[PDB]
Write a protein that binds this DNA or RNA. Structure first.
Ligand SMILES: Nc1ccn([C@H]2C[C@H](O)[C@@H](COP(=O)(O)OP(=O)(O)OP(=O)(O)O)O2)c(=O)n1
Ligand SMILES: [Ca+2]
Ligand SMILES: [Ca+2]
Ligand SMILES: [Ca+2]
Length: 341
DNA sequence: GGCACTGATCGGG
DNA sequence: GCCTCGATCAGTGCC
């Protein structure tokens, strides 16, 4: 088919600029402050003026300040970005009945029934860009190609404030030339399991015999890569259904005292029910992040919905199970809810 | 043998 | 750091 992928530019930082245009041209850094002490936490994202100098998503706020001590550091206002995002997604709904909202700032549209060729798709992407800038003053990047994967690769290639088509010949080109590490779904861990098999371009997956592949990276990832390499990857645009909702907070200090952990757990439950809104979950998981940043979790499913009160008692029992079965101290604690009615 | 669960892992935003 | 974060894996109960 023809797939049009849309990815909002430096999204959180850009929303802050739209709400305060005085920020334009200055380096802006959106931060997630944990609360342990002044400037503990991580950068969620930064605009290009800050990113130019190495201030990127994930780094410690303290490291960012080392690099650009005079930048504007703003606390993440996720609920604001979520509202702006919801409005832009509503705009995209008008350009295709088949839309897949992939995350807070990305969506795929199947525009097969809306255009005959790539020339026409390109024009449709420009139209969408202009509509989003018109209504919300947000810039975005558009990628277009024959499937979801190469559409995303296109947008990657053209950001910021871009638009690009990857046509059939170029798809055949990329299967040959593009490094596997640049293929969506290959991370550091799988990339280096591939290097260690010698695989470094997509075409190579087709000459290695399946089980050396499957054996090392898994059945699913092997099939995925092979289908891309055969130019046979087809995955429809499907509406996404939220499968879980939760909240995990950082404690003021590592601990494995139940009475000390409890107040953070109950706050996580409270904030989680607020986010659930009308969704009633049948499953609850307590989730612990250990001092060495590992993640442990224990859950229970009920043949019925979980009332806040049942969430409160069950969560303590689940936290207790985690304390027995793992002796590392806990750094972050929260819950996730799922299996909605 | 293979389906339905579970917690851990991996890739990603 | 936190997720309006989900998919897939190995280990297992089960038919
Ligand atoms: N480790 C990360 C990565 C991303 N985000 C959030 C903030 C980003 O703005 C948003 C979108 O991700 P991109 O990965 O799309 O980030 P920008 O949109 O920030 O980057 P770009 O303009 O390159 O797309 O998700 C986050 O909180 N933590
Ligand atoms: Ca994105
Ligand atoms: Ca983006
Ligand atoms: Ca990559």
């Amino acid at each position: 088919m023809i797939v049009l992928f849309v990815d909002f530019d430096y999204f959180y930082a850009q929303v802050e600029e739209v709400l305060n245009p005085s920020l334009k041209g200055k380096p802006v850094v959106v931060c997630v402050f944990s609360g342990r002490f002044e400037d503990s936490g991580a950068v969620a994202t930064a605009n290009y003026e800050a990113r130019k100098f190495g201030v990127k998503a994930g780094i410690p706020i303290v490291e960012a300040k080392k690099i650009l001590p005079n930048a504007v550091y703003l606390p993440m206002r996720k609920e604001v970005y979520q509202q702006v995002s919801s409005r832009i997604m509503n705009l995209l709904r008008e350009y295709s009945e088949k839309i897949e909202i992939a995350s807070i700032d990305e969506a795929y549209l199947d525009i097969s029934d809306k255009v005959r060729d790539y020339r026409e798709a390109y024009n449709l992407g420009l139209e969408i860009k202009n509509k989003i800038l018109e209504k919300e003053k947000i810039t975005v990047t558009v990628g277009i190609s024959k499937n979801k994967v190469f559409a995303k690769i296109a947008a990657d290639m053209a950001k910021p404030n871009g638009i690009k088509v990857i046509d059939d010949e170029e798809v055949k080109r990329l299967i040959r030339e593009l490094d596997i590490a640049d293929v969506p779904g290959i991370g550091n861990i799988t990339a280096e399991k591939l290097k260690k098999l010698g695989i470094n371009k997509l075409v190579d997956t087709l000459s290695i015999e399946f089980d050396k592949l499957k054996g090392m990276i898994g059945e699913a990832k092997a099939k995925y890569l092979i289908s891309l390499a055969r130019d046979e990857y087809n995955e429809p645009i499907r509406t996404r259904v939220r499968k879980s909702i939760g909240r995990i907070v950082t404690m003021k200090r590592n601990s494995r005292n139940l009475e000390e952990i409890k107040p953070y757990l109950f706050r996580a439950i409270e904030e989680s029910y607020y986010k659930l809104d009308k969704r009633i979950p049948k499953a609850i998981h307590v989730v612990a992040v250990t001092e060495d940043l590992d993640i442990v979790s224990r859950g229970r499913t009920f043949p019925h919905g979980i009332s806040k009160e049942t969430a409160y008692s069950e969560s303590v029992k689940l936290l207790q199970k985690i304390l027995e079965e793992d002796e590392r101290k806990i750094r972050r604690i929260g819950v996730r809810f799922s299996k909605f009615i």
